[PDB]
Ligand binder design. Sequence first.
Ligand SMILES: Nc1ncnc2c1ncn2[C@@H]1O[C@H](COP(=O)(O)OP(=O)(O)OP(=O)(O)O)[C@@H](O)[C@H]1O
Ligand SMILES: Nc1ncnc2c1ncn2[C@@H]1O[C@H](COP(=O)(O)OP(=O)(O)OP(=O)(O)O)[C@@H](O)[C@H]1O
Lengths: 285, 285
Amino acid sequence: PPQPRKKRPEDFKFGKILGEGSFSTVVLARELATSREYAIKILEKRHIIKENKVPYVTRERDVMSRLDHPFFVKLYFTFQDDEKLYFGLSYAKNGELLKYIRKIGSFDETCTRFYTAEIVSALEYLHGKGIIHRDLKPENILLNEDMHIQITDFGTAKVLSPARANSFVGTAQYVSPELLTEKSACKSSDLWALGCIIYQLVAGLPPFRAGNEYLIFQKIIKLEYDFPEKFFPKARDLVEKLLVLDATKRLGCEEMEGYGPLKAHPFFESVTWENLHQQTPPKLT
Amino acid sequence: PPQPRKKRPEDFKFGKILGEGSFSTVVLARELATSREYAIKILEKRHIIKENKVPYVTRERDVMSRLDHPFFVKLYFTFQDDEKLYFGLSYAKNGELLKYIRKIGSFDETCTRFYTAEIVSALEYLHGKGIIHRDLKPENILLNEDMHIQITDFGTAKVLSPARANSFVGTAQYVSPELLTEKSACKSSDLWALGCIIYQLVAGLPPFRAGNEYLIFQKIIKLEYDFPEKFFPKARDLVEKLLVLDATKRLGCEEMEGYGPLKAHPFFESVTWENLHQQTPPKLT
Ligand SMILES: Nc1ncnc2c1ncn2[C@@H]1O[C@H](COP(=O)(O)OP(=O)(O)OP(=O)(O)O)[C@@H](O)[C@H]1O
Ligand SMILES: Nc1ncnc2c1ncn2[C@@H]1O[C@H](COP(=O)(O)OP(=O)(O)OP(=O)(O)O)[C@@H](O)[C@H]1O
């Protein structure tokens, strides 16, 4: 079926740089014909080819095109000129979830519960499509103008077919033990990251911290971390059921019978899971 | 490039009927996996085939798929089962513009100007793609939750290639004289409808009214109508430059040098055309 004409650089008025990565730069752009604002990720083809990143850029596009859920950054269009590729993405006006963690120090119980629930809901959708994020972190969980989450950064995701993996290792503080021991990744690897994120929301800092990566990995494989006295009891119990060395024993994984038991955890008692994105997010402190 | 899986009836929880047409019924539906609300237009295949409406249903889908502008109802997806076709459309929460005309009687100058400007902007986009609506009317100009317009009903549109036409005749009160005399339609036919709509917004009733269709057509070809004393002066001048029998002399048409002169009309003096959908619509009385 016919689709709109392929867009081009001239159709936009580019503005400020929203972010810079190793193989891309995201720029805020206003489409002239509609006045719509998009976050356009620009990637130089030559650099991508030189560093053998074609599989990653291709995967990012393919995975995003398959996602159709309110808690994920949307890919509206793509186009390219002689030197660059352009991905038209939804513009998450409020930035990274990490920004708010730093801004207010830590989230109260109500805000922790709400945002954790949205992340859990997003992961259920993602995992339901046999996709592993592999680099889930506050930096990758953006916030739209209404303060609902919008997860992004899928170039390093893993699309399951069988849960084999290997090759990529996400941000050190959120790396699961299986990636360091067996060099493998599965859906449960994301649940481990979830556990670190919940801990970070409540404590204000991720569970495993150290002077360098080697030391962080060392703490991870030994499950070396502890909870501060204040930590919300039910949240602590949940984290303990997520930060489990054995990937088959993490609440939410297939061997633990899926998302049902996870969403039924006491910490989420007052959560209505059916329409989170229609709910008004609690105000951050 | 991969796309989401084809949706199906079971993916939705259908609700109330939003509207009923001769070959379709629009139903409010909530997608289970996202809690998103869509207005799903359902059309029975057998009926469509019996009445030879395949060209119309096909055109509706094709035209909508080509539109990517904030002032038009969006087509998100399509699917079908053994008996029906389903079009997933954006849900215009506030209904038809006609509803508000009846609700408050008539629009003040500020509201008339704002909504007329959005319609003009929508038509510029539509015409820029060589598409003639052919049945533009308050009933076809919906309003989203933010009170910005969303034009719909494209099955009877005409996609230009050369401005030939003929075959279909829209709602009597908005029919242009060329359709009644030469049995032809062009972009300017929509501008005539625009003139009737502006008049209706200000007067509260369309320009040409009568007991039946024959009498309405009779008044149209004779340009038989008049303005009530109150009518905003500049709005009147604009309408007089739109309701012109000769289609090549309507403000906004190609022979009159396009949308530039139309948007520059005195009635729109204080209008900023670049970002109308980013502006807060004036409150209706
Ligand atoms: N859709 C978006 N809306 C608003 N901001 C965004 C969006 N996408 C990305 N950003 C911002 O731009 C930054 C850079 O994104 P990009 O994908 O180009 O590199 P990165 O993934 O952050 O780093 P790298 O790819 O090297 O790991 C992000 O960290 C984020 O702050
Ligand atoms: N996207 C939408 N969102 C909300 N309401 C809608 C939407 N589309 C249509 N409607 C409502 O449903 C009604 C019926 O639409 P439909 O296209 O099924 O028939 P119609 O075009 O109104 O009549 P006919 O096709 O016989 O001329 C519309 O008049 C409008 O009131």
